[PDB]
Design a protein around this nucleic acid. Structure first.
Ligand SMILES: [K+]
Ligand SMILES: [K+]
Ligand SMILES: [K+]
Ligand SMILES: [K+]
Ligand SMILES: [K+]
Ligand SMILES: [K+]
Ligand SMILES: [K+]
Ligand SMILES: [K+]
Ligand SMILES: [K+]
Ligand SMILES: [K+]
Ligand SMILES: [K+]
Ligand SMILES: [Mg+2]
Ligand SMILES: [Mg+2]
Ligand SMILES: [Mg+2]
Ligand SMILES: [Mg+2]
Ligand SMILES: [Mg+2]
Ligand SMILES: [Mg+2]
Ligand SMILES: [Mg+2]
Ligand SMILES: [Mg+2]
Ligand SMILES: [Mg+2]
Ligand SMILES: [Mg+2]
Ligand SMILES: [Mg+2]
Ligand SMILES: [Mg+2]
Ligand SMILES: [Mg+2]
Ligand SMILES: [Mg+2]
Ligand SMILES: [Mg+2]
Ligand SMILES: [Mg+2]
Ligand SMILES: [Mg+2]
Ligand SMILES: [Mg+2]
Ligand SMILES: [Mg+2]
Ligand SMILES: [Mg+2]
Ligand SMILES: [Mg+2]
Ligand SMILES: [Mg+2]
Ligand SMILES: [Mg+2]
Ligand SMILES: [Mg+2]
Ligand SMILES: [Mg+2]
Ligand SMILES: [Mg+2]
Ligand SMILES: [Mg+2]
Ligand SMILES: [Mg+2]
Ligand SMILES: [Mg+2]
Lengths: 155, 224, 206
RNA sequence: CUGCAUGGCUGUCGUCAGCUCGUGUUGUGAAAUGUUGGGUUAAGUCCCGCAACGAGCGCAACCCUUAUCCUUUGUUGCCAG
RNA sequence: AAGGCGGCCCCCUGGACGAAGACUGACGCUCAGGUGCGAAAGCGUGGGGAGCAAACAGGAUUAGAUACCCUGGUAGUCCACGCCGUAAACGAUGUCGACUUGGAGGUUGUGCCCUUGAGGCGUGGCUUCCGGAGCUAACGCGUUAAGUCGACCGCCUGGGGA
RNA sequence: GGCGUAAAGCGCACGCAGGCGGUUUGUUAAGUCAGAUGUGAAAUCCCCGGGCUCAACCUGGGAACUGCAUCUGAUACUGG
């Protein structure tokens, strides 16, 4: 029912008296393809357990985005610690023009045509954070008309 | 419930104006003795509203979990909880009761098993060793979660006393999506609570009236 | 640190011996070595017959060997020529006559010898050690074992540097002498060297 | 020949009291919490308190021997009447 | 204004703040180049020299000890008038203006209330410590912002070489 | 795009040139905006077509050349 993507697997370490202890971290995203997205981060001593933890984490932790038949409503900007993200709707037939970490998020979101660009840090975790936060702050025209209390043509 | 029982129970008395929280400026009538005075005409309709939705939750067969662990108010809460066929938390709130239900349900399984062997098992195989420990550990289990032993699953509403002393349970309920009903004293913040009721919380008569009225209204919830 | 052999430390407490004969120091060494020869045989000709334990017992002047097995049909064979073709040669090796009995192990997934043999047989078939280990553990734990832990060691996956990798599950109190601990060892001879496998299975106390 | 390709076995820190995990929670993250705090113990031993709740390998017990008594049997061992 | 300023008295003199009014009527803010002020050490000329003390000498310590420690000790430290123009000259945070939840203090004015005390209720200036939103890579900052904004100026563009 | 700690706030101030300018009314029309006219060579780029068996290539018409000058209007904002 939901599409799942594995974005990053990293090996991290922690020193003890005996020596170094290695662990694996997995960052994944899951979506339904019609405007629901979640990201998940997992850690484990072994990789498949880490990936399963991240998928379990991301089946919860899922937000809604209001799409316009496969593309955004307007140009959006998202920001997290080091990552700045600019996304912009495109015409039919452009495809997802985005970086490696944005591409999975926008693919499993159900978006089909955007032009995106990453500035600053392209650390995958923060880039996924910023893309999610820039998608969630994007508003549909009917909610703008509800805000302003007037449902004029511009819908 | 109306205005004058709430005055003479001392619902209007706040904490000192040193320890106030800004977010509850709207529910503050004034100050005397450098003591906040809680606004009472604000308390009455939102209390009634909380009571109404508690009733409706009650008759759709909702499980309600009273929370109060103050030494001076928790016996009133056991009183009110089993007077109205509901559940209570009177001793220390285990961090993770709701978000980590999968793990604490083994604690309640342990509690149930060693109580069925307690005296309708009637083993009294003593070992030289195990009265002193098995009995004391049943005590340790039932004083902290003996009020939750019959819940089975996640509750349907949180009734809170003194939201600041009970921030862990409130944030747990906010993550899990359970409604929170809290008496909000002048020093606590109301943003985790979805049904705010400003009143006094340190006096035992305010608490008595609160849970008397709520126990009543859920008893006539289960009445339907 | 180095551990005590968990079967040896429990001999006479909860675990019995694999040989139950008496002898003076006159015939002790030859009894012992002819037992070694019979055991070496009943190891190496019943290789793929899943034998777990060989109990040798010597009444007055003759032997009886009890073979614990998971697959009794192959060591009892087609109407029973095969225990004949075994005792005719075990009486040959031990010089005295012989008798053979065959006991069945009904759950071959709760015996450390069979589980070790399984994991080494898979390791010699070029299978990823992780899958062997985890399947052994989950099969042993889904049949009522109170605990298990497996450990493989030595050039895993053809690496140049040998490693020791172990997987535990349940409860294995090796310091409790009451503990029913079934332990065994096996070795897989691959194209990169020997790989050692150890298996502990805990079934209960007393 | 290569223990610097390995299995098995052994020494060592050290019989030192420690070493971790699941779920939850906190942090963008490496990670943290639990395992810290007040007492106590030979001991992460135990009790209180506590965003933690539980579990595993260790500690302790279960094993052998020595120190007291009782019952049974009585030679090849014993000698009170 | 910054550098800085500490017995008491007198003379000359700059700024700040408050009360209630009166007056002028945008006369304002910032500022490249320019000008002025600018710790300590140092330099020039002339005085002064108690204490302290670079250099220097001796005694120790040490493998050595051009040091740390001890006994001495000159320039200098002090005054007048010139020069120098640099400091971790730091809040490592340019100036000016507006806006945005709180708490506890210090100091200096002023208004009102039985001034009944070393009482209570207000309203200005300057200042210290916590901390909310927000911001930040984090640490932290947080109405005296590193928050939200405007005007002008200075500066940065990998580490060495420098 | 930055300048508390990563490179980066002059040691501090005064101040000329320069940049910037509270509020109201009137006036002007310099900035600004609208329209028109002249010009912005052809070729090149782009659109719609046409010819070489297709393509490259060649070619018809348009669009564009974001600019400048002049004339006529607008007066909210900036300037006088
Ligand atoms: K070795
Ligand atoms: K954990
Ligand atoms: K003065
Ligand atoms: K200058
Ligand atoms: K001196
Ligand atoms: K030396
Ligand atoms: K001198
Ligand atoms: K300073
Ligand atoms: K941090
Ligand atoms: K400047
Ligand atoms: K260079
Ligand atoms: Mg530790
Ligand atoms: Mg800790
Ligand atoms: Mg323990
Ligand atoms: Mg604890
Ligand atoms: Mg000087
Ligand atoms: Mg001089
Ligand atoms: Mg001189
Ligand atoms: Mg000296
Ligand atoms: Mg000199
Ligand atoms: Mg001078
Ligand atoms: Mg300098
Ligand atoms: Mg200074
Ligand atoms: Mg500087
Ligand atoms: Mg500042
Ligand atoms: Mg100035
Ligand atoms: Mg602060
Ligand atoms: Mg360079
Ligand atoms: Mg930069
Ligand atoms: Mg530095
Ligand atoms: Mg710097
Ligand atoms: Mg400065
Ligand atoms: Mg300078
Ligand atoms: Mg100027
Ligand atoms: Mg000027
Ligand atoms: Mg103006
Ligand atoms: Mg001007
Ligand atoms: Mg004009
Ligand atoms: Mg054609
Ligand atoms: Mg004008």
């Amino acid at each position: 029912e939901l599409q799942e993507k594995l974005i990053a697997v990293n090996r991290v370490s922690k020193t003890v008296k005996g020596g170094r202890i290695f662990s694996f971290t997995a960052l994944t995203v899951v979506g339904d393809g019609n405007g629901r997205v979640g990201f998940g981060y997992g850690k484990a001593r072994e990789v498949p357990a880490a990936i399963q933890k991240a998928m379990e984490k991301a089946r919860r932790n899922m937000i809604n985005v209001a799409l316009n038949n496969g593309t955004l409503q307007h140009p959006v900007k998202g920001v997290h610690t080091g990552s700045r993200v600019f996304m912009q709707p495109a015409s039919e037939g452009t495809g997802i023009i985005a970086g490696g970490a944005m591409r999975a998020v926008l693919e499993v979101a159900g978006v089909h045509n955007v032009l995106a660009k990453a500035y600053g840090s392209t650390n995958p975790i923060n880039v996924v954070r910023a893309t999610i936060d820039g998608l969630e702050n994007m508003n549909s025209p009917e909610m703008v008309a509800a805000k302003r209390g007037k449902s004029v043509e511009e819908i | 419930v109306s205005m004058r029982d709430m005055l003479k129970a001392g619902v209007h008395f706040g904490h000192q104006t040193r320890y106030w929280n800004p977010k509850m400026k709207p529910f503050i009538f004034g100050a005397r003795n450098k003591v906040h005075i809680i606004n009472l005409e604000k308390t009455v309709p939102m209390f009634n509203e909380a009571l109404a939705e508690l009733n409706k939750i009650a008759s759709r067969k909702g499980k309600i979990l009273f929370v109060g662990t103050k030494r001076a108010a928790s016996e009133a809460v056991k009183d009110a909880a089993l007077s109205c066929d509901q559940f209570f938390v009177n001793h220390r709130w285990l961090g993770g009761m709701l978000t980590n239900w999968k793990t604490v349900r083994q604690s309640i399984k342990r509690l149930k098993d060693l109580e069925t062997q307690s005296q309708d098992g009637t083993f009294d195989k003593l070992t030289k060793k195990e009265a002193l420990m098995r009995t004391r550990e049943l005590e340790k289990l039932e004083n902290s979660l003996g009020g939750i032993k019959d819940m089975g699953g996640l509750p349907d509403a949180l009734f809170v006393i003194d939201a600041d002393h009970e921030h862990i349970a409130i944030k747990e309920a906010n993550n899990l999506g359970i409604p929170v009903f809290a008496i909000v004293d002048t020093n606590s913040d109301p943003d985790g609570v979805d049904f705010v009721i400003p009143g006094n919380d340190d006096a035992i008569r305010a608490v008595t009236l609160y849970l008397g009225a709520v126990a009543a209204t859920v008893r006539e919830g289960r009445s339907q | 640190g180095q551990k005590v052999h968990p079967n040896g430390i429990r001999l006479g407490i909860v675990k019995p011996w694999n040989s139950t004969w008496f002898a003076n120091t006159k015939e002790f060494a030859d009894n012992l070595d002819s037992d070694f020869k019979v055991r070496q045989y009943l190891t190496k000709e019943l290789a793929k017959a899943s034998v777990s334990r060989i109990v040798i017992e010597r009444p007055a002047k003759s032997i009886r060997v009890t073979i614990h097995t998971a697959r009794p049909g192959i060591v009892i064979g087609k109407k029973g020529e095969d225990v004949e073709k075994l005792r005719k040669v075990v009486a040959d090796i031990a010089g005295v006559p012989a008798q053979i009995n065959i006991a069945e192990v009904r759950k071959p997934e709760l015996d450390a010898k069979l589980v070790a043999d399984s994991i080494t047989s898979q390791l010699e078939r070029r299978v990823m050690f992780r899958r062997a280990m985890k399947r052994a553990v989950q099969n042993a734990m889904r049949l009522g074992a109170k605990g298990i832990k497996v450990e493989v060691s030595g050039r895993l996956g053809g690496a140049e540097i040998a490693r020791t990798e172990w997987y535990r599950e349940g409860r294995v109190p090796l310091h409790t002498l009451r503990a029913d601990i079934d332990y065994n060892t096996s070795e897989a001879h691959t194209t990169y060297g020997v790989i050692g496998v150890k298996v502990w299975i805990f079934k209960g106390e007393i």
